[PDB]
Amino acid sequence: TPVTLAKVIKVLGRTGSRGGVTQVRVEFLEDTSRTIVRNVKGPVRENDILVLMESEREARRLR
Amino acid sequence: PKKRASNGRNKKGRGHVKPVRCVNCSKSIPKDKAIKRMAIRNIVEAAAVRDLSEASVYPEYALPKTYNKLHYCVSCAIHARIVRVRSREDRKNRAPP
Amino acid sequence: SQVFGVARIYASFNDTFVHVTDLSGKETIARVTGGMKVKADRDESSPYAAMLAAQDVAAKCKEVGITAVHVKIRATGGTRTKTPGPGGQAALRALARSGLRIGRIEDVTPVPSDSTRKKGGRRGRRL
Amino acid sequence: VLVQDLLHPTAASEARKHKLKTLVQGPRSYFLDVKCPGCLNITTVFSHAQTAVTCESCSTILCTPTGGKAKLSEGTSFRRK
Amino acid sequence: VDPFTRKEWFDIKAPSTFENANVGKTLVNKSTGLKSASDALKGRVVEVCLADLQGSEDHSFRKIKLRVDEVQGKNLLTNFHGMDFTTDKLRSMVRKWQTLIEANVTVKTSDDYVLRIFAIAFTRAQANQVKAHSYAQSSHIRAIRKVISEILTKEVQGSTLAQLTSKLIPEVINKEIENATKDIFPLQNIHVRKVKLLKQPKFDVGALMALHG
RNA sequence: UAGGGGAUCGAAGAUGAUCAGAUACCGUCGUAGUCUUAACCAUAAACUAUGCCGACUAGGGAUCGGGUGGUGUUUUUUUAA
């Protein structure tokens, strides 16, 4: 069970039908300059340390 | 109404033309009117290409394409939102974007 | 230092094939059709059947000593679509996931120089 | 143009305009006195052949016929007239 | 039962008129008292890109069809079967907006093989050419195809498969086209695209064993 | 109408679908016909739903075909052509 803790930089644009999804960059805290663009589910900001055991799915923009 | 100073399509001096069948309608339909498009994409996709130049036995190969044309009825052209309805005036245009 | 079986994939619609042979292919080995790994019988062409299907192709290829692989995609083809269905994508990424190596990729979709009159009827297929 | 002398315009505008409108019609083609090198003889050839003419008799060749103007050979002074 | 306990393998070699002889393996199938196995899967082809042969990456596209003529040891030798482009690269090089042309010509080589070849070839524009194009006239194309006919019977009589083969690898016919053509028309891309056998004559084991050492 | 051609589509016919019915829509096959020679028929939203000849009124800016003129644009080869 390998946990990669990734920091959010750029909160991007709202998504989903119901606005349940923001989009999301992320800066890998623990390998800085990698800057992948996953999704998440929450009422987000910039700096929400974000938690992924799935290193990486890199994700694409969901109606 | 007339609608459309051509008529629909592409035919003059030329009287009558060898028709085409629709990929989708699976209708027939002359090679004027038609409404043709090249998709062209990488067989590969974005997500995987990373697991491909990864586990290949190739120290890179390249990424070979995937050719094809595509024929459409005008009906199925709008149902499938390829062509739309352009107001009257935005018709007599003819630009990709 | 490796050996090469040839793939011999294909996905229209409503079904898909992972189908290993030799590199010549007058012999064959572990063939896997969609329905097989899905009894809904509904989605016989699923982005998934393919998925758990390809993994059969590296169970019964990492059985009889196929390290590695070259890889073929075919549509229907024929008259038909020449628009590859779901399959072939999910396979082409699950096959890379299964230790397998990859080499030489290319379509084969059977193209005609016209002629065989396509089905439907003039006024078309129509709901 | 609200007006113009179409009598005599420019010399320009004729050179370019079509043979049959310079007003009074006149040809473009014109004749061309040829020394083949060997002989001095001088044959009176036409700019648009249709015939290649032979030079005088030396049996020589001259000028091939094409769309409009001969292509004349190498030797030929081809002074015009 | 198992359908891999019985399955004896093999090795694929290739003319010497090539590089890495070494292609991979195949699967075949043993016998009984009376009845045989080796012949039971010989005649058959294998088709591998130019590449894993010439080693090179410039022919990165284009595949060789080889066929096994006879066994030995486990090392099945090989004779040339035919040529292919990748597909794709044929359907790519073609554009909209411009002329397309076509070739062909059959041929008694002398080795006495009967071969049909395909020379696809386009117009290219000019470097410096308003218009959006690059078209042909037509009569010029008539003249274009006839040229090609001779330029190929000629590099086929002057002959053999072995001697022919190494005029396909280094694409030298491609050159010979452009320099009889320029003294016309511009041209590009000019393949041979294919190439297929028909009426290949009798075996002659070593006319082939002389292609190895 | 009688010969040739009969790839593909594809009324008719058969079908499986959907549906309260579905002889229709959707899907797959399919004679006939589409193609051609030779002969018929003469209809059409045969559509600018605007008879043709002419002659006269009010501005433009495009284009195809000609023709005329500008020590006009390049072509460059030496100047033209």
Q: Hey, where are the domains in chain B?
A: 1-97
How many angstroms is C1' of F29 away from CA of C125?
14
With b for 16 or more beta-carbon neighbours within 10 A and e for fewer, the C53-80 pattern comes to bbbbbbebbeebebbbbbbbbbbbbebb
| Strand order, beta sheet including A27-28 | A27-28, A4-7, A50-52
Give residue C87's domain range: 1-127
Widest pairwise Cα distance in chain E: 78
SS3 of chain E: helix, strand, coil, percent, to 5: 10, 10, 80
CA distance E171 to E192: 8
Separation in Å, CA E181 to CA E119, E122, E138, E141, E177: 14, 12, 15, 11, 6
CA distance B85 to E20: 60
B2 CB below 7 A from strand F atoms: yes
Q: Using only the alpha carbons of chain A, give its radius of gyration.
A: 12
Of E92, E128, E115, residue with least CA distance to E167: E115
The count of domains in chain A is 1
Asked whether the beta carbons of A26 and A12 are under 8 A apart, the reply is no
Give residue A19's domain range: 1-63
Handedness of CA A46, A47, A51, A52 (dihedral sign): positive
Chain C residue numbers touching E49 (CB-CB < 8 A): 104
D71 CB below 7 A from strand F atoms: no
C125 CB below 7 A from strand F atoms: yes
| Strand order, beta sheet including C10-11 | C10-11, C16-19, C31-33
- How many residue pairs bridge chain A and chain B with CB atoms within 8 Å of each other? 4
The count of domains in chain C is 1
- DSSP-based three-state secondary structure for E146: helix
Report resolution in angstroms: 3.7
Q: What are all long-range contacts of B19-24, with beta carbons under 8 Å and residues at least 24 apart?
A: B20/B71, B21/B71, B21/C118, B21/C120, B22/B71, B22/B72, B22/B73, B22/B76, B22/C124, B23/B70, B23/B71, B23/B72, B23/C81, B23/C82, B23/C83, B24/B72, B24/B73, B24/B76, B24/B80
With b for 16 or more beta-carbon neighbours within 10 A and e for fewer, the A5-24 pattern comes to ebbbeebeeeeeeeeebbbb
Question: Residue E59, preceding bond cis, omega within 30 degrees?
Answer: no
Provide the positions of strand F that have an atom within 7 A of a protein CB.
7-11, 25-30, 48-49, 66-72, 81
Closest CB from C24, C29, C107 relative to E45: C24
